[PDB]
Amino acid sequence: FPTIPLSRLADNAWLRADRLNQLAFDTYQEFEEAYIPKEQIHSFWWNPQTSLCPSESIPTPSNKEETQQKSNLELLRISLLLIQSWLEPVQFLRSVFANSLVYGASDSNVYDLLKDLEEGIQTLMGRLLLKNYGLLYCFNKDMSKVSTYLRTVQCRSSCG
Amino acid sequence: PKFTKCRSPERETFSCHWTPIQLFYTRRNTQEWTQEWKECPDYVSAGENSCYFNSSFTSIWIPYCIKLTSNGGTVDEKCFSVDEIVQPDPPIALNWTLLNVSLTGIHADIQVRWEAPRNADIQKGWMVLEYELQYKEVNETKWKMMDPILTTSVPVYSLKVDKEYEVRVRSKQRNSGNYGEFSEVLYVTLPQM
Amino acid sequence: PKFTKCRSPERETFSCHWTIQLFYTRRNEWKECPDYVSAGENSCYFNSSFTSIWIPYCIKLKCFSVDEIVQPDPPIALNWTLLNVSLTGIHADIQVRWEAPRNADIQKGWMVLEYELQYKEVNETKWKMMDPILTTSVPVYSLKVDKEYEVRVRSKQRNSGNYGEFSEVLYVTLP
């Protein structure tokens, strides 16, 4: 039973990545669905300042083909790397999360979650206005990445 | 002509539609936008007045932009990344199980269970599916919607044993895209005691 | 001399009690009880700072992992609603409703609960236990309208830890 099996670790790691994912998505949708004019959707992909992402420099699989090819270790690194890339900048959205009626995103949840998740990934490894809009897109993409990667690593070593 | 929409059924491939008309794409793949506008890789597979992109052309968390070209210049132009356009297939094998009947013979509880779309790689974890099940007395106009679950099973309480019910189930990728089409409806008739 | 029990009520913190100091360690370097007061007496309290869910713990006055020692507080705000009474008057069906422990976190996602509801006629000696639901609402059927029933419901996090203490008992008297 527990020596904390590895299912435990993977189960919890993903769940955590999954909340940060709903958190990241929903506040992203909300923000846009409340501040961005229909004609301004995705205006961030093309703007001299808010084009760049906190992790532009990190290696990331762009599909199942690539992702599954990576192993349980290189997938946890990308995820841990990605996570840390967000530790300081995620606080730029602090307000955004605090003036948000999104389910569970107020006080300091998001940043805290990032921290615990960093610890969980770390453990598994050894054992193994448009500016605001832009960042929220970025955070969701990256949160989706982590979630997607850890789920893969999770469904590798049960589930269905 | 205009774009009707785009949809990735299993987060691995996607196709765009509209109502000689051509479609070209470009995406932020090598880094910034250095991919020379290209033309629909497949005009037939996804049916007519459509374009189809196989898993070798589909990339996630990547920005795509697509142009509809007509007789005279650009006619339509849309931009996205696949996850926004993910719409999973409907779940299959809808089937109920009687749970229990009250001794008043008025109410009953049933467990509704179903299977995951066959094309969604949930087994390897590329996809995490979430479902919404709606049910309603057969002669109603309004449907009663359940809170999204992640399970492929759920109980449905306090049904009136004297009524007949019908159930449908929707599918969506956990945290992205939209729900898909509703499964086949399941009709339920409780034990006529 | 006897470590009585360690437990986490919400999965973010935990405490150890016994019947005289305590030293704790983790894996991935023995340290002393950081709080002897906060959790009452003959008890070591660990805030969220020393509470992590990943690496296991060993303490000296027993070895566990926070998930092993998780017990959520009991649900609150129990109460029922008549559904309707059988025509012959003999039986009634009601719907029992309740609220998650106040410390129990929704927006978290870290503490996910499932609940066991028990009920028995005021004079029965043993209880009727229902299969653990994931909702805060569940229907109780075929109650003899002639009796008074008492319902109590306990909780535990999903597939980890154990059950907590029963909520206050909710008494039920059918019309």
From Swiss-Prot, chain C:
This is Growth hormone-binding protein. Changing residue 152 to H: Found in a patient with idiopathic short stature; uncertain significance. Changing residue 72 to Q: In LARS; disrupts GH binding. Glycans are attached at residues 47, 79, 84, 123. Coiled coil: none annotated. Changing residue 95 to P: In LARS; almost completely abolishes GH-binding at cell surface and in membrane fractions. It comes from Homo sapiens. The soluble form (GHBP) acts as a reservoir of growth hormone in plasma and may be a modulator/inhibitor of GH signaling. Residues 1-175 are extracellular. Disulfide bonds join 6-16, 33-44, 58-63. Residues 74-175 form the Fibronectin type-III domain. A motif (WSXWS motif) lies at residues 163-167. It is found in: Secreted. The gene is GHR.
